[PDB]
């Protein structure tokens, strides 16, 4: 179906299929030498050079080697530099180059590759859509937006562009404008629209505007395997971890951490108040669009398993204390932070990204009335000097209706059933 052989390559088709036969038989090093031979003897042959690239790609998998993949990536480029390359082959080679650049994390190189592809193939909608993802992957949502706006001008019912356009709208807090794009997009069934991110955000946008259809989509996303439950909608998960919204210390096994937080709560409180009074800039406003209204700021000591040395200058004894507990300081999918919330604050229902952490809250300054936190179907209050533990991969919601500030200390821990192997290896979040 794909014509990958130019006029000259047809005259050596037999030698080309022989080396490709070797590659599909898994005979990778024999196949590497064979495509090298063809390359040295026919250095202009696009199909030969692609063969060498695909072998180097497979070898990078056999060896799990980034350096070998870096060479494959250059050879895929070489294919495109040669004369008389058939369009099917040029597109296959540059597409895979971009895919492997992203896999390594060269998202800026991927973007240049993708821009070239769109220039070479200006009627291919799927490439313009891939370019959008390129821009999303480097956090350039303004250029991604323009890309899917171009695509939707020409093909208004391209669903991939509709769910990605929705996602962007929603990230810009255009909740109502995003709901029809996400809904119609998912409903299109086009490749790339059955993704947990889009169910996640569609239901959340509906919850925000007050549409009881929201849980219809959470049910569906659950039915299609994106969510472990209708209530627990995290997307970076290890399957099989125990799942309950509220935990006791004993249930977690981190009883020594919990005792240290409760015994030494006042030194933690006092260092937080000192920062509020003399270094309030260390408290950064929440910036994940989780607030309906109000004021909510966090002062973070550890994130992604890494101590913030400047921040720990503002809470030095607290950071000394926590160092004894690698179940939190090495939780690379969690944080350690103070969190201040003031009256008139409502945090939208939301879910954290991963089921691999549990969240501890130590009460530090808790007004007598007006502060509560719901996780799933149960609402609780904090207590000064006491720890509450919840799984923030379950939906949860917070209110602050007191007459003065509420300060807590937040300590993320590795889910207790995760092995030491998993805790060393899971990518950070």
């Amino acid at each position: 179906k794909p014509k990958l052989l130019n006029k000259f390559d047809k005259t050596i088709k037999a030698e080309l299929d022989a080396a490709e036969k070797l590659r599909k038989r898994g005979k990778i090093e024999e196949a590497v030498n064979a495509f090298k031979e063809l390359v040295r003897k026919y250095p202009q042959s696009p199909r030969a050079r692609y063969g060498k690239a695909q072998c180097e790609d497979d070898l990078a998998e056999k060896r799990r080697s980034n350096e070998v993949l870096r060479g494959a990536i250059e050879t895929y480029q070489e294919v495109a530099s040669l004369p008389d390359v058939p369009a099917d082959l040029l597109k296959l080679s540059l597409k895979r180059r971009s895919d492997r650049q992203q896999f390594l994390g060269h998202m800026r190189g991927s973007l240049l590759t993708l821009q070239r592809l769109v220039q070479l193939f200006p009627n291919d909608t799927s490439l313009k859509n891939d370019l959008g993802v390129g821009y999303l992957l480097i956090g350039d949502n303004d250029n991604a937006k323009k890309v899917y706006e171009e695509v939707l001008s020409v093909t208004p019912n391209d669903g991939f562009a509709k769910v990605h356009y929705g996602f962007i709208l929603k990230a810009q807090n255009k909740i109502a404008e995003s709901i029809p794009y996400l809904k119609e997009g998912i409903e299109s069934g086009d490749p790339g629209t059955d993704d947990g991110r889009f169910y996640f955000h569609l239901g959340d946008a509906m919850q925000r505007v007050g549409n009881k259809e929201a849980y219809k989509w959470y049910e569906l996303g659950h039915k299609r395997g994106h969510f472990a439950s209708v209530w627990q909608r995290s997307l970076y998960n290890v399957n099989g971890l125990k799942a309950q919204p509220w935990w006791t210390p004993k249930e977690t096994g981190y009883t020594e951490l919990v005792k240290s937080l409760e015994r030494n709560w006042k030194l933690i409180r006092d260092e937080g108040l000192a920062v509020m009074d003399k270094a309030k800039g260390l408290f950064l406003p929440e910036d994940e669009n989780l607030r309906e209204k109000g004021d909510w700021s966090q002062f973070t000591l550890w994130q992604q398993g890494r101590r913030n040395e400047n921040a720990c200058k503002g809470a030095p004894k607290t950071c000394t204390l926590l160092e004894k507990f690698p179940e939190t300081t090495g939780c690379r999918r969690g944080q350690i932070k103070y969190s201040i919330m003031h009256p008139g604050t409502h945090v939208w229902p939301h879910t954290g990204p991963t089921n691999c952490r549990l969240r501890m809250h130590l009460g530090l300054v808790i007004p007598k009335e007006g502060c509560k936190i719901r996780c799933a179907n149960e609402t609780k209050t904090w207590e000064e000097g006491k720890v509450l533990i919840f799984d923030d991969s379950f939906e949860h919601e917070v209110w602050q209706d007191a007459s003065s500030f509420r300060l807590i200390f937040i300590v993320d821990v590795w889910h207790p059933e995760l092995t030491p192997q998993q805790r060393r290896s899971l990518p950070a979040i």
Partner: peptide, 18 residues
Amino acid sequence: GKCKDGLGEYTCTSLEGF
């Protein structure tokens, strides 16, 4: 841009290879 309390980024992990 990182996913701390939510799922607002397009991707929450950072691709850095094998």
